[PDB]
Amino acid sequence: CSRDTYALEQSLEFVRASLTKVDPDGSYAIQENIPLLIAGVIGGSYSSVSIQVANLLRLFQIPQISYASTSAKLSDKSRYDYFARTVPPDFY
Amino acid sequence: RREIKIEGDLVLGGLFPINECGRINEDRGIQRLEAMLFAIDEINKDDYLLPGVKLGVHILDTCSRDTYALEQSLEFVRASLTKVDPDGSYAIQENIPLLIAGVIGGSYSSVSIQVANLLRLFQIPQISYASTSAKLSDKSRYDYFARTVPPDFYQAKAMAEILRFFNWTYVSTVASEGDYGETGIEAFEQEARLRNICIATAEKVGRSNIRKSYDSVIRELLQKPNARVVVLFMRSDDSRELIAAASRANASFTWVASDGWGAQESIIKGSEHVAYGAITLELASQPVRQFDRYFQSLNPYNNHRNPWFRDFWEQKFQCSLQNKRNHRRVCDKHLAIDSSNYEQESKIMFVVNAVYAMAHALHKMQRTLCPNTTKLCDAMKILDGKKLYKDYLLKINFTAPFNPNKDADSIVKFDTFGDGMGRYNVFNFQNVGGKYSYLKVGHWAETLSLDVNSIHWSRNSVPTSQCSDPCAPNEMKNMQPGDVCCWICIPCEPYE
Numbered sequence: 273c274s275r276d277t278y279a280l281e282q283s284l285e286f287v288r289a290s291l292t293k294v295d296p297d298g299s300y301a302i303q304e305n306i307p308l309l310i311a312g313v314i315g316g317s318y319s320s321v322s323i324q325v326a327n328l329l330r331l332f333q334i335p336q337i338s339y340a341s342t343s344a345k346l347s348d349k350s351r352y353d354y355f356a357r358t359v360p361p362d363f364y
Numbered sequence: 365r366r367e368i369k370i371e372g373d374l375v376l377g378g379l380f381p382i383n384e385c386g387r388i389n390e391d392r393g394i395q396r397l398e399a400m401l402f403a404i405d406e407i408n409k410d411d412y413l414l415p416g417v418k419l420g421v422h423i424l425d426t427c428s429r430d431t432y433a434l435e436q437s438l439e440f441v442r443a444s445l446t447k448v449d450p451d452g453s454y455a456i457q458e459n460i461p462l463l464i465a466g467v468i469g470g471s472y473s474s475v476s477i478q479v480a481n482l483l484r485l486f487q488i489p490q491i492s493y494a495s496t497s498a499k500l501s502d503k504s505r506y507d508y509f510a511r512t513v514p515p516d517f518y519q520a521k522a523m524a525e526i527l528r529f530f531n532w533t534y535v536s537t538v539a540s541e542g543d544y545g546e547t548g549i550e551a552f553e554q555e556a557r558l559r560n561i562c563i564a565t566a567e568k569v570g571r572s573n574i575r576k577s578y579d580s581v582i583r584e585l586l587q588k589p590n591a592r593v594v595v596l597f598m599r600s601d602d603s604r605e606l607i608a609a610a611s612r613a614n615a616s617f618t619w620v621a622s623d624g625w626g627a628q629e630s631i632i633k634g635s636e637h638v639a640y641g642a643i644t645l646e647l648a649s650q651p652v653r654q655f656d657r658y659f660q661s662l663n664p665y666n667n668h669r670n671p672w673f674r675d676f677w678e679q680k681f682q683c684s685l686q687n688k689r690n691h692r693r694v695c696d697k698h699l700a701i702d703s704s705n706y707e708q709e710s711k712i713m714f715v716v717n718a719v720y721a722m723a724h725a726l727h728k729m730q731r732t733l734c735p736n737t738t739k740l741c742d743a744m745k746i747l748d749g750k751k752l753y754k755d756y757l758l759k760i761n762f763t764a765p766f767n768p769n770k771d772a773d774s775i776v777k778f779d780t781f782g783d784g785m786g787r788y789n790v791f792n793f794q795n796v797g798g799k800y801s802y803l804k805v806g807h808w809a810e811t812l813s814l815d816v817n818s819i820h821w822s823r824n825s826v827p828t829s830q831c832s833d834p835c836a837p838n839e840m841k842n843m844q845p846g847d848v849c850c851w852i853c854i855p856c857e858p859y860e
């Protein structure tokens with residue numbers, strides 16, 4: 273939705289798969305809809321969305337590749353050590 | 365995977381370095397854990413603040429590592445996603461994690477940084493009790509992290525002033541890798557450059573558990589006999605490792621230590637011969653007598669909440685229990701920790717202050733967001749992290765919980781950077797009556813207040829942490845022949 277908070281919520285939905293495995297006891301059995309373990313995240317349009325999702329995925333060592341985030345704030349690998357892109361940075 | 369859980373409407377997270385992870389951190393970690401537990405019990409026992417709502421606990425061991433602390437914070441945060449996630453046959457109960465109102469913990473800078481980066485995604489306020497690093501001062505990267513302790517540049521400039529007071533121009537320094545040691549040593553180097561103090565060697569260590577690097581660092585320190593003062597800036601584990609390495613060799617440096625070492629009994633207890641005039645500095649604080657009497661009465665069969673308490677007793681008293689009955693002796697029934705057994709940690713009151721700050725923020729939110737009642741309501745069912753933090757934590761101002769003096773310092777105030785007052789107590793590891801023990805020798809709030817007559821230097825002489833000569837520029841000059849910073853005298857002709 274071109275917003276940082278909504279993208280953060282969607283990345284939370286993405287990442288709610290590794291914690292499910294370590295978490296599920298109950299009567300009989302529970303199936304519901306088990307989230308799949310995301311091998312890597314492809315997305316991150318707009319710089320705010322990419323920054324938020326990279327900050328989220330740096331906690332779960334989930335690689336992220338962006339297609340349109342051409343901001344220079346994501347160039348450094350210290351804050352975002354699992355974020356990459358196929359587009360040039362912003363100073364160019 | 366040992367966890368401490370107490371049922372309650374609002375639960376406060378707990379991050380402590382209980383295990384230093386196979387060995388238990390006796391003085392720091394478990395004492396801080398007990399301080400938090402005692403503060404929460406006092407909060408639940410008095411009706412003046414938070415009368416109706418009960419404050420649960422969620423305490424986890426960080427093992428003094430960033431990855432383990434990250435995993436424990438993941439365990440903490442796996443409560444909001446559970447509610448939005450659970451269909452299944454019949455019903456599923458298991459063990460529903462409780463929604464953490466706020467996280468109280470974050471010893472060591474790396475743990476605090478990782479947990480703050482985790483909680484910034486869930487608007488969960490975090491209050492630290494021992495992370496005195498300057499990297500967390502900014503509110504941009506960490507917009508939900510605060511602390512009851514001053515930042516690191518105050519400590520760095522205090523160390524620089526201590527060096528300058530004794531004219532220790534030529535010093536050697538060893539720093540720890542990561543977020544605390546690196547930033548703190550950068551600030552200290554900047555302060556030394558401002559005050560014209562030349563560092564002989566800048567060494568960095570790591571938590572690789574390899575003594576070879578530590579003894580190599582000790583040998584490198586020995587390579588500069590002129591710099592007999594070591595400004596040691598590292599964590600407790602790294603300080604202990606370097607103390608052991610220097611004890612393996614023959615070193616007699618006067619370690620000007622930081623809050624990482626401070627007034628710690630385990631580091632010196634490893635070996636007391638290497639350290640005899642170490643001018644350490646820790647966060648200035650007053651011991652809590654209520655927590656003293658709470659911890660003195662603690663017994664292995666009395667406090668069943670802590671899964672580590674039995675192992676704490678076994679490690680501290682060296683006596684095993686009936687589980688083994690062959691490795692060691694049997695602990696006495698009259699055995700206790702009443703007196704002459706433990707020394708109060710200087711950051712216990714900081715833990716109490718952090719817990720009471722979180723409690724007072726919750727109480728103010730209840731008095732504002734949930735009026736006409738002192739118990740839980742619909743408004744308090746869901747907590748707004750941004751509002752709670754920004755309003756009732758960054759603008760909080762309350763007196764100290766247990767301080768009959770009620771002096772000016774008995775006020776917990778969060779500045780614009782979410783930090784505490786810059787007060788430091790400078791101790792020296794001197795001997796007064798044949799028994800080694802720390803005792804306060806100075807103070808630093810805005811300027812040094814030091815007692816030279818009660819220092820008792822190593823080798824019973826004032827250290828000379830200077831190069832060959834400061835030289836006289838009136839009739840000579842300097843050329844820096846061998847050292848980048850040190851120099852020598854070359855006489856100047858009358859016509860030059």
Ligand SMILES: *[C@@H]1O[C@H](CO)[C@@H](O[C@@H]2O[C@H](CO)[C@@H](O)[C@H](O)[C@H]2NC(C)=O)[C@H](O)[C@H]1NC(C)=O
Pocket residue numbers: 529530531
């Ligand atoms: C540290 O260096 C300063 C600068 O020399 C010393 O200050 C003066 O030292 C001379 C003797 O060297 C005294 O006659 C002066 O009275 C001192 N003036 C002041 C304002 O201190 C200082 O004594 C030195 N301190 C130590 C512990 O060596």
